[PDB]
Write a protein that binds this ligand. Sequence first.
Ligand SMILES: O=C(O)CCC(=O)C(=O)O
Ligand SMILES: O=C(O)CCC(=O)C(=O)O
Ligand SMILES: [Fe+3]
Ligand SMILES: [Fe+3]
Ligand SMILES: [Fe+3]
Ligand SMILES: [Fe+3]
Ligand SMILES: [Fe+3]
Ligand SMILES: [Fe+3]
Lengths: 205, 205
Amino acid sequence: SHMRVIDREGVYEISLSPTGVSRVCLYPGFVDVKEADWILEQLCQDVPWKQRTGIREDITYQQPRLTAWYGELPYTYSRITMEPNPHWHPVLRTLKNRIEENTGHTFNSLLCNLYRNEKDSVDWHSDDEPSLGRCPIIASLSFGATRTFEMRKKPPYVERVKIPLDHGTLLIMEGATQADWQHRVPKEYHSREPRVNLTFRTVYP
Amino acid sequence: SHMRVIDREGVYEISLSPTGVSRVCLYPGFVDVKEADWILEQLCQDVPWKQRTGIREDITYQQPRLTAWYGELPYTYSRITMEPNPHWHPVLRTLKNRIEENTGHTFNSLLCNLYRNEKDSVDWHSDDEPSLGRCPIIASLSFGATRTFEMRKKPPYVERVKIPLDHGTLLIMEGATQADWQHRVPKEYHSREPRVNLTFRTVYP
Ligand SMILES: O=C(O)CCC(=O)C(=O)O
Ligand SMILES: O=C(O)CCC(=O)C(=O)O
Ligand SMILES: [Fe+3]
Ligand SMILES: [Fe+3]
Ligand SMILES: [Fe+3]
Ligand SMILES: [Fe+3]
Ligand SMILES: [Fe+3]
Ligand SMILES: [Fe+3]
């Protein structure tokens, strides 16, 4: 099979070309369940979730998910639409610090994603906004219902990877992953409770 | 013993506090011996080595080692003294690309170090120049004679680490290593042939 499903702790080199190594690292249980329960409640209630207008392939649409931003915002993104808050919620500051102290990598930008139910999603894309630089390090922490993080390798051989992201799981993407792969979170065809995802990035001048 | 000697391939978390995880990764034989022989000759001959004036604890001195720079230069360093070349030597461009494609991390600055014999050295320091940011990723590739990379943990328990860096070995430092540790290359008391070290960094605005 040209497809792999990964739900185990580990470091995975999913491809070595054409750009270089694409690496994803999975840490299930990074936040234990009872603390993850409490974090989910606080973020659900306190983050200023909005359904925002997006563009993809130069055309404007309402995203099928709620979002909010903290810290730095990727430079080609609209400040007026995305409303990034320079004041981090204390739970989000704690989680930022925990991820940084444990992974050794720093971040200055946070996109909060809320998938309200199975009809919410994000379509195929790469995190290749240019103010992220070449080969960015991106950390993803999930709470709430499990949803699937799908990956597909771009054309010029396992060429598809699926990662269920369950409650308290940390995912890191680094290396050539954004140059050589796309990812999405598909809609589901059975009921899903809400999911909150936190995606931490570094935005540069 | 409060001291560890490391010469084996691996990922090492040498401390977890006070700042976060300090991680060093060692890859002996990153360049195979015959290619490493040829690279050593070309760099020895072609890099414009100079004995440059340094400062440490606000006082000026001639460094007991030869150096040259390529690409970006850490912002508090003098351009006139360090003479960074924006045009990379083709061997150095190849090695930069190889390190990036294999590690997944990018670099924009290179300090070349030549330890002429056992009397050359670099004293205790951290790579904590502020334009490197918090918790920089630094890659080190060595050629020629083996010399020892010593590390000592800063005071507020293995608190000392020694890493022999032999011909073709790649060393990566990341995480809290520069905040929480210092490192040096000591003089030796037996003959040493020359050693070339390449230290790749990312300098930010
Ligand atoms: O919800 C997720 O896990 C993925 C979100 C994502 O790819 C993004 O925000 O860029
Ligand atoms: O020669 C070495 O391996 C170490 C050099 C070093 O620490 C530096 O250039 O900052
Ligand atoms: Fe597991
Ligand atoms: Fe790749
Ligand atoms: Fe994404
Ligand atoms: Fe080994
Ligand atoms: Fe540490
Ligand atoms: Fe150093």
